[PDB]
Design an enzyme around this catalytic site. Sequence first.
Site, mmCIF file in Angstrom:
data_model
loop_
_atom_site.group_PDB
_atom_site.id
_atom_site.type_symbol
_atom_site.label_atom_id
_atom_site.label_comp_id
_atom_site.label_asym_id
_atom_site.label_seq_id
_atom_site.Cartn_x
_atom_site.Cartn_y
_atom_site.Cartn_z
ATOM 1 N N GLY A 35 2.521 4.600 -2.103
ATOM 2 C CA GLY A 35 2.535 6.027 -1.858
ATOM 3 C C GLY A 35 1.156 6.643 -1.732
ATOM 4 N N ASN A 36 1.095 7.953 -1.941
ATOM 5 C CA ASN A 36 -0.141 8.711 -1.887
ATOM 6 C C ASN A 36 0.095 9.983 -2.686
ATOM 7 O OD1 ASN A 36 1.224 9.879 0.874
ATOM 8 N ND2 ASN A 36 0.724 7.713 1.128
ATOM 9 N N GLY B 18 -5.673 2.653 2.290
ATOM 10 C CA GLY B 18 -6.116 1.287 2.088
ATOM 11 C C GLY B 18 -7.040 0.896 0.944
ATOM 12 N N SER C 14 -5.600 9.423 3.160
ATOM 13 C CA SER C 14 -4.334 8.736 3.349
ATOM 14 C C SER C 14 -3.868 8.929 4.798
ATOM 15 C CB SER C 14 -3.307 9.312 2.364
ATOM 16 O OG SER C 14 -1.988 8.889 2.648
ATOM 17 N N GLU D 83 -1.113 9.331 5.676
ATOM 18 C CA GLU D 83 0.013 10.258 5.599
ATOM 19 C C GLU D 83 -0.418 11.610 5.041
ATOM 20 O OE1 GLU D 83 2.667 7.253 3.337
ATOM 21 O OE2 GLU D 83 3.889 8.005 5.010
ATOM 22 N N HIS E 182 4.040 11.304 -2.950
ATOM 23 C CA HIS E 182 4.862 10.686 -1.922
ATOM 24 C C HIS E 182 4.950 9.190 -2.150
ATOM 25 C CE1 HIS E 182 6.402 9.165 1.864
ATOM 26 N NE2 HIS E 182 5.279 8.522 2.128
ATOM 27 N N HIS F 94 7.651 5.358 -1.414
ATOM 28 C CA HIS F 94 8.713 4.699 -0.661
ATOM 29 C C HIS F 94 9.577 3.942 -1.679
ATOM 30 C CE1 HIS F 94 6.027 4.593 3.187
ATOM 31 N NE2 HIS F 94 5.656 5.581 2.404
ATOM 32 N N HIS G 81 12.393 6.338 5.645
ATOM 33 C CA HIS G 81 11.010 6.416 5.157
ATOM 34 C C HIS G 81 10.802 6.394 3.636
ATOM 35 C CE1 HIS G 81 6.717 8.196 5.881
ATOM 36 N NE2 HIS G 81 6.734 7.494 4.767
#
Lengths: 206, 206, 206, 206
Positions: free
Chosen positions: A28-29, A44, A71, A73, A92, A94, A155
């Site tokens: 995530g971020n 990354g 990010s 995103e 956020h 996944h 997502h």
Amino acid sequence: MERNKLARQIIDTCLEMTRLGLNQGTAGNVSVRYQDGMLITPTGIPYEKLTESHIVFIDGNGKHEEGKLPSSEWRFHMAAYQSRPDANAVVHNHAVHCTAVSILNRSIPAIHYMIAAAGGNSIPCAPYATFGTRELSEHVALALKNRKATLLQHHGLIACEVNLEKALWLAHEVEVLAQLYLTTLAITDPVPVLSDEEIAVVLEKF
Amino acid sequence: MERNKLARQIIDTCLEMTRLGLNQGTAGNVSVRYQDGMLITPTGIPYEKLTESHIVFIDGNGKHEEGKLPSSEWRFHMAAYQSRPDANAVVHNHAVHCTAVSILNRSIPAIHYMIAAAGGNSIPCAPYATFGTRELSEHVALALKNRKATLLQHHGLIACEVNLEKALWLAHEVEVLAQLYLTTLAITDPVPVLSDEEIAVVLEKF
Amino acid sequence: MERNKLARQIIDTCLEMTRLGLNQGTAGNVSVRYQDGMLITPTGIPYEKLTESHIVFIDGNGKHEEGKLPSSEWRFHMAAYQSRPDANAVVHNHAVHCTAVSILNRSIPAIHYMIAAAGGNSIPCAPYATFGTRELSEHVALALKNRKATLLQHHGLIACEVNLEKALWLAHEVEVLAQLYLTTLAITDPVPVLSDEEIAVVLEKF
Amino acid sequence: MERNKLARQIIDTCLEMTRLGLNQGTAGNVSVRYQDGMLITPTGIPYEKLTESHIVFIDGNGKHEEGKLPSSEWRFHMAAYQSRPDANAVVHNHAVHCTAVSILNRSIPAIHYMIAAAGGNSIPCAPYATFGTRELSEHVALALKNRKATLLQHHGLIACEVNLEKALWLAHEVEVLAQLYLTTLAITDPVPVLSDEEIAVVLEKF
Ligand SMILES: [Cl-]
Ligand SMILES: [Cl-]
Ligand SMILES: [Cl-]
Ligand SMILES: [Cl-]
Ligand SMILES: [Zn+2]
Ligand SMILES: [Zn+2]
Ligand SMILES: [Zn+2]
Ligand SMILES: [Zn+2]
């Protein structure tokens, strides 16, 4: 509001998010509203290598400080902040169960009274658009208009609150609700739910 | 490229693989391309007892150094390296969700955009052949022609990348995709998927 | 064979069994063949409080040393030892997936090649009888005649091998096979399986 | 009975409850009968920040000490104590599998012999009423009349015993039974069960 205290908290959120098992896989971020922009995790760099110096600042025009890549995103965190002016932290991920429900493109209904935590009687599912795309930003901005959390089709999950731990809690709570949903859905469809009215009462007591 | 730095990384990968819960039960095997052969984990030594001295070298003719027995599944790592000349690390395991999907002998379709990580819009499933057999090697070599990861029918998962952590990531990511697949498959079959075109876009952004 | 080295290993097995998540809830019991009887975990002492001094010895006539109460399920460990004269360690638990399959009163078929580890092409399910009862002992003795592990209907799992870690491995491996079984069974029934012949080959290579 | 030894045990129970994975998400609450009232965890303080000084005392009239707010769900712990005069510890949580079964509004039948641990051949499910409401108290008081544990519809689990660890055990054991139930229910409905008579025998041996 000190840039570095905020940076330390973000890394701690990323670590804790891995601890609850929300992070890992796609990863995530996290971000916090800051000055005119926001402080967001960089693209990354595994939480392990992270440090206060890796946290990137994007201003109001989407410009990030030189030599640091935010990010991939980052666009929808800004959509989060613009949509919910009361939100100061966006998480956020996944997470497995949230993502599975969004694969079915279903909202999570009032199966448990805690769903009121997101602000209503449901956790919506925003339509699909390529990640880091501007159209995805609209989909999410529209979903967070009236809810503090939303699922993103094929997502993951995006949840916001007034601070980082409340945002982490919410995100974690949505995984729980997602899992209760999948589990009972595999036995009966539709799954029993609390009426809007009961939810209203809970919202009242919350 | 120093034999011992590579050996330490392999043990670390094996440990980390147990940490994510991919290893344990049947147990996997890891290897890195090296000189003319490869460095691979030995057969029958639990990650705990492992040390740089247990890592075995097999040359180009399949000859391993005296007094050391390589993994009983060493043959298909070579098939991995020969099939994907860009791969420098192969991670093989019998992770729960990957193995379950291969029991159904199904490929994992584009249920989530991260599937592009394996190089396309699917994670294939190679046909069954006895482990450590040469026919199994062909099945896998054929599957990895165009994908960085493949499932092995009634067996497990095999994923490769340019280095060990990217290979570990991929392998871990495939477990996630496998789990999203099983979970939604138990509710609806077929499970909704992203079109090849959307995948093309993602492949582009990747 | 020293009474105390064996006692330390038993506690370690109990601890490790909790670590893999097999133990906890109803809790299992472990034992090692010893002299004319066996050394078995005592009834009602959580692994945490355990010590070499709590491990109880039951001789050949079922007589246990004074002041110590063996596991309430000690009778079928003796049935294990009497049935498989090659077994020197018995691990019994109520692991989640094994127990669920025994609730369906089904054997686990050749869904994965590792099932050969139990000695054949299946993991049987022994009929129900009250725990600590003599009739339960016959049911299990009969099941272990030709298999190293068996499930106990509406009860759990019992696995044996030549030593403790191989017995722990087997027990752990049976949970894995149980889980692959439940997972694929919820999608398709019957679940695809390897032919007896393929199993024969694997048994050969094992 | 010393106020502080009891307070330390409660925090330890809350910690251990998180360790088994029962706590987290909505979070539970624990209490011990004390003097004329009870000692209960406070509302809104994560187990991490907890200390002996946060544990709140509510007397017999429901009056809590000044400056401390007890759990928002304190009313049904009193219903627990009043209903089961033999209970000295109440553990309440929103564990995943228990909550899912209560979403289906089903009792858990005699699928495994350990269900006798709750005092009979079933784990009931009390009807829904808003949390912290007096009507919810009646629902639970009625359910615990003859059982040591009960599920709360669209809510969670509440289990009691003579002391904290036995209450924690029970609560943990009910999650296990809940999970065996969901797992087998997704394959066959109705799930095979032991007759009332077999349960009677087990109750006898317990
Ligand atoms: Cl609304
Ligand atoms: Cl292609
Ligand atoms: Cl046979
Ligand atoms: Cl009754
Ligand atoms: Zn994302
Ligand atoms: Zn293998
Ligand atoms: Zn047992
Ligand atoms: Zn509650």
